[PDB]
Design a binder for this molecule. Structure first.
Ligand SMILES: NC(=O)c1ccc[n+]([C@@H]2O[C@H](COP(=O)([O-])OP(=O)(O)OC[C@H]3O[C@@H](n4cnc5c(N)ncnc54)[C@H](O)[C@@H]3O)[C@@H](O)[C@H]2O)c1
Ligand SMILES: NC(=O)c1ccc[n+]([C@@H]2O[C@H](COP(=O)([O-])OP(=O)(O)OC[C@H]3O[C@@H](n4cnc5c(N)ncnc54)[C@H](O)[C@@H]3O)[C@@H](O)[C@H]2O)c1
Ligand SMILES: NC(=O)c1ccc[n+]([C@@H]2O[C@H](COP(=O)([O-])OP(=O)(O)OC[C@H]3O[C@@H](n4cnc5c(N)ncnc54)[C@H](O)[C@@H]3O)[C@@H](O)[C@H]2O)c1
Ligand SMILES: NC(=O)c1ccc[n+]([C@@H]2O[C@H](COP(=O)([O-])OP(=O)(O)OC[C@H]3O[C@@H](n4cnc5c(N)ncnc54)[C@H](O)[C@@H]3O)[C@@H](O)[C@H]2O)c1
Ligand SMILES: [Zn+2]
Ligand SMILES: [Zn+2]
Ligand SMILES: [Zn+2]
Ligand SMILES: [Zn+2]
Ligand SMILES: [Zn+2]
Ligand SMILES: [Zn+2]
Ligand SMILES: [Zn+2]
Ligand SMILES: [Zn+2]
Lengths: 358, 358, 358, 358
């Protein structure tokens, strides 16, 4: 702990800039602002999510509005440097991965275990709560998960790994199931790696972008890729079922949040199929209602995660998923605008951009 | 068996008229067309569903198209009059309730028990398969369910009772759950009666029609009714949550198939809530995507039923549900156009119209 | 707050006696021992559970051992008299019902919502944690549930109501299901009332005790009672299926914890049936393994509850369950040995004995 | 079709011998006994299951009693040689894998999809229904699953593969779950291969037999093996949890049917753990009731399968599971007693013994 704490900010005007941030260095060196059960973590690595890019470029997601200077990022791991005297769970020096989510333990979504839906949740990347794109953060120990000697880029990947896992779990994917992934951005790709490790088969992944498809095929040889053309939902699903052999997918994990892609997924899945939407987009979309109806197709949606962390860790420690392999670009904190620019331009060839504090 | 077999037909031109129908009387008197495992049933009573009215008035549902002279109706009970020699299960003289659905027993939806999604299904009211608005029908015994001394109007109610039950089951309604019903037409009303017998509470039912709301309150005193005004989905859900006390529903059973009503339901239910759509409407609707997303709201849809019959029977025999109480109008077969006219004009005061063959 | 705090104690020697208890009066009058988020409740009413009787008479349940002077009782409601300054949720004067369970919010069973399995749980009636058979208790606010103007005997019934609900929920009981209840002690009876409100049918309840059967039939007219005779499991299940009509139960809610009763339940339920054991008994029992096997019968077990409280409250407020009707005996705190004696002798005619502090 | 039809028989006296069998050659050459929807299959390969060995050596399983000359075997694939004119699904020359199970399509377990529990089921290896250890069998087409150019030993493995899959599915195994397998006989081994392909981790398998453990480790390098010593259930579970790291298994797939092994599994699994018993043994076993109780441990049991076939096929075609690798011994039909002797003596080094008709 020697450097001044800076952070990566955006505003309603859609600027992105670095600036000084809390806690202050001095604060952390003497453990001033450190509350009950809290620690200070030196953030070593942080992935840029579609989340962040959308907040930067647009200022909102749904009810989530950037109303003033706001620090981004929520996919992070780092080193514990200060510890409140109460903190039993964790010690100075520990590599940890940060679950960007603080829970009240008292509302219904908390007590029934669906704690991503907590009624008083602080979700770190989400306005007004400051993100993790800073050099130091104060965070409750119970949300800093020990990772032993795991690399920091892996530890940071634990968060979108968790998005994939929570999706998978609520989607109900099982060994033998034919699974469709729509979108080969970071989340699609991790979700595909996940389906594959889960024994899904056959596996198909779609995208508008050939390059991201060739990447998907390199990191998961057994998948069948499908480049999407301008077609009605109905017609797109035929193509898709062709890519599967002639088998209709049991589950579509939708990772674009885009109208046409969700429609084709509704047309593509089997009778009693599940279309699970991880992606995020417009406030309102047009849905093919009657196709969903006559097919008993379940439409499901994800809002972050819960109870994925110990399991995400296990998958990485046992080599069941290979995450680090998805980070194409690495930028130091100070160069964050370079990071966001490349993370937003697909011509870049970027998949997962990491911002680091070594 | 003395009268000529007539039926109630519609066409792409949206006519509704009575006309001669198969099997012929003589055919049934000597058991000509009677295949393996089949019986002939003298249809005693048949309810008019929204289904039928929509086929008559519009010629389709989704992929379901009336392309020529087609016999309607699928909510029926009646008396067995002829029996193939193989038929073990059922005897001449038996009151039966007819499950309007013939299964291939060989496709995946059949073998996994989701047999409403059979790939070669004959669903009797559905083109091209002739409905049950006839005097006699030939039907496999395994789809004629014994009802002992139950009334025929009850026996006929067994089918929309079944729609309610299959909804309830897949929606996951349980004792103690707060449940919203949208629409107080026949299906809403049966679904409300069902939720109530299931210990749902509190119970709210919406409609645009005050009269159908006052009826709902008469047949289910403990329900809270809610008349819908022209409001944004968001604002409508606030009203709805007000009608609940301040509790947000766990499950919305949507029985109108209408866009605005489905939207408000998405806004109304709790975090991790389920909006279950029984209703049917437009090929495409606008959905509030981000509200669904941030709330982890499951959108589900129903396509008929399976394995509801023995259970629907139990509920009626034990007095747990009171169905006959919903039939407001009774018409003889010959007067079917009167029946459909009244079943389609809400000013009629009709709830469930039955067409009979005494 | 005027009286000295006494409590109801047992020991390894199987004595039961009243004695002074913590917190002390003075402690509560000035709010000494009151920690963060805690309140002091004046316990108004407390039911004696089979739990308590077994601890008194035997000194253990499974791994739960009375090793020294221990305060019993965990089915309680009462009045809030002192409040830590932090406590937001609750105010002095509030009637509350006490969930006898303190959670760490950090272990896996806690975060996934199965918080009855918390790895560091304080369960109040359970050694070494002091029960609720005292005049005052200090308890976290988040486990004191507001009950407005509900009676204290109802508020106290909320706990075994909760045992029934958690059973029901994990057993998977639904509207239309035929349900067997084994045992007509307090828990059986509440579970029966629950099944009934849940639209279970038909309902059968067994017991060795005719009097408790006649009581069951009085409070739930529609149930069929079954007196158990000395018979093989197989033969007992035939009798049981006879009591059902000829329908085999979908679910057996077993509330005796006794070997022969569990066996007959395994024989009684349908193919793919669930036998759910609420009852507690011997460390080891003999099971009919092959019957379970060839029938795909799920054996399930309950350990208390979670997330039943707001729902238990709703059922009582809406008149869906009538609990107070089960309390046959009422004793003041000081007369607790009379209470336990009568609660343990079935010749008493007791169902639910309450101990009160008016 | 040239050879006389012989079969492998056992009797109540526990003899095993080969003898002439139905249908007769001539019968098959002219398609005499061929009913509606039926085909004749020339059985090419058939695995010996624990089932068969137990029927041979003991004469029963539970209610399943060998009462006279009975043909064994139910794990088979072979070639279609005759086809009833109705048979659409399948053609002469097709390699098929035989699902040893004929369904009535009319009882409740059939229509709800749990069709392994059919009330009028013919299960081929099970008395009185003749097994598949014959040269020709007549079987309904809908239970002969096309396998294209798959090997016959794989096609035959499809049946115990199916036992594993149905277990897995009802046990609820998912990606990331720590899974315990008890027993390294054929079923354990396939179940382990299955868990592994399902992304289970860590994986532990137990056995009394070191050789079968070394085999397990060869075919699944990433598994941790555990040799069982004579210890209390409690103490055995500690050892087991040690083999896992210190993580407690989510699911125990029990494949021995033995009392002590099931007990340790009950002690071993986590809170809310599932112990799923595939194995079969004594009519009655002693259970550790209180451990199950305080842990909310679900005990589940399997009776064969349903809807595993298309999925078992997919797993083999995509190389997700490697079955053929488990067949250690291959015997021609005529040498069946050699086959059963070796399949019953573990000193043999046998895992899966196949009996063939080339
Ligand atoms: N719900 C959550 O909790 C959660 C968590 C993480 C990410 N997300 C969301 O998941 C989405 C994807 O995340 P990402 O980081 O991979 O973003 P990304 O932009 O890198 O990936 C989106 C991909 O979708 C592809 N795409 C666009 N239109 C398509 C179409 N019509 N068909 C097929 N593919 C199409 C793009 O080419 C791109 O590769 C984002 O909207 C993000 O906000 C949600
Ligand atoms: N999915 C299935 O298998 C299945 C089975 C039976 C019926 N249905 C469908 O269920 C729907 C209802 O059936 P029904 O027989 O009761 O028809 P119905 O017209 O009698 O009932 C529809 C009700 O919706 C009310 N309504 C219209 N707009 C509304 C709004 N904005 N908010 C609240 N209420 C509104 C109407 O006033 C009417 O009372 C139909 O569309 C029918 O086809 C589906
Ligand atoms: N698992 C939990 O979290 C939990 C919570 C509450 C109560 N319980 C347990 O539930 C059980 C019942 O509680 P209770 O308060 O009603 O006790 P209780 O003794 O009042 O009820 C037991 C009943 O079982 C009857 N019975 C005994 N043998 C029988 C047999 N062979 N067949 C049928 N009935 C038989 C008795 O006559 C008695 O009526 C107790 O063992 C108690 O510890 C468990
Ligand atoms: N339920 C079904 O539908 C179904 C289907 C197939 C097989 N099975 C049953 O599964 C069981 C296993 O089948 P299999 O063909 O592998 O038989 P098998 O005898 O080859 O395997 C049993 C294994 O259990 C091991 N074992 C014995 N005692 C043990 C203990 N105390 N701890 C750990 N391991 C122990 C043995 O060494 C042996 O390797 C049989 O009982 C069989 O009948 C059931
Ligand atoms: Zn993200
Ligand atoms: Zn909360
Ligand atoms: Zn209808
Ligand atoms: Zn079918
Ligand atoms: Zn109790
Ligand atoms: Zn805990
Ligand atoms: Zn077998
Ligand atoms: Zn059957």
């Amino acid at each position: 702990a020697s450097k001044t704490n800076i952070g990566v900010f955006t505003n309603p005007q859609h600027d992105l800039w670095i600036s000084e941030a809390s806690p202050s260095l001095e604060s952390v060196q003497k453990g001033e602002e450190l509350k009950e059960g809290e620690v200070t973590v030196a953030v070593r690595s942080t992935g840029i999510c579609g989340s962040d890019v959308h907040f930067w470029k647009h200022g909102c997601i749904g009810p989530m509005i950037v109303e003033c200077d706001h620090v981004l990022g929520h996919e992070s791991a780092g080193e514990v440097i200060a510890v409140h005297p109460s903190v039993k769970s964790i010690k100075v020096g520990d590599r940890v991965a940060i679950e960007p989510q603080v829970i009240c333990n008292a509302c219904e979504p908390c007590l029934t275990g669906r704690y991503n839906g907590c009624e008083r949740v602080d979700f770190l990347s989400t306005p007004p709560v400051p993100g993790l794109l800073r050099r130091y953060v104060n965070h409750p120990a119970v949300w800093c998960h020990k990772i032993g000697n795991m690399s920091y880029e892996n530890g940071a990947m634990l968060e979108p790994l968790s998005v994939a896992l929570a999706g998978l779990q609520r989607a109900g994917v099982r060994l033998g199931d034919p699974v469709l992934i729509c979108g080969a951005g970071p989340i699609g790709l991790i979700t595909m790696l996940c389906a594959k490790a889960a024994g899904a088969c056959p596996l198909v992944i779609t995208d508008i972008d050939e390059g991201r498809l060739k990447f998907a095929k390199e990191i998961c040889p057994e998948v069948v890729t499908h480049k999407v053309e301008r077609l009605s939902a109905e017609e797109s699903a035929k193509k898709i079922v062709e890519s599967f052999g002639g088998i209709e997918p049991a589950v579509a994990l939708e990772c674009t949040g885009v109208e046409s892609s969700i429609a084709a997924a509704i047309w593509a899945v089997k009778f009693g199929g599940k279309v699970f939407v991880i992606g995020v987009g417009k406030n309102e979309i047009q849905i093919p209602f009657m196709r969903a109806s006559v097919r008993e197709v379940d439409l499901q949606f994800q809002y972050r995660y819960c109870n994925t962390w110990p399991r995400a860790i296990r998958l990485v420690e046992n080599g069941l998923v290979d995450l680090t392999r998805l980070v194409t670009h690495r930028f130091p904190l100070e160069d964050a605008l370079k990071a966001f620019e490349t993370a937003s331009d697909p011509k870049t060839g970027a998949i997962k951009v990491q911002i680091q504090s070594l």
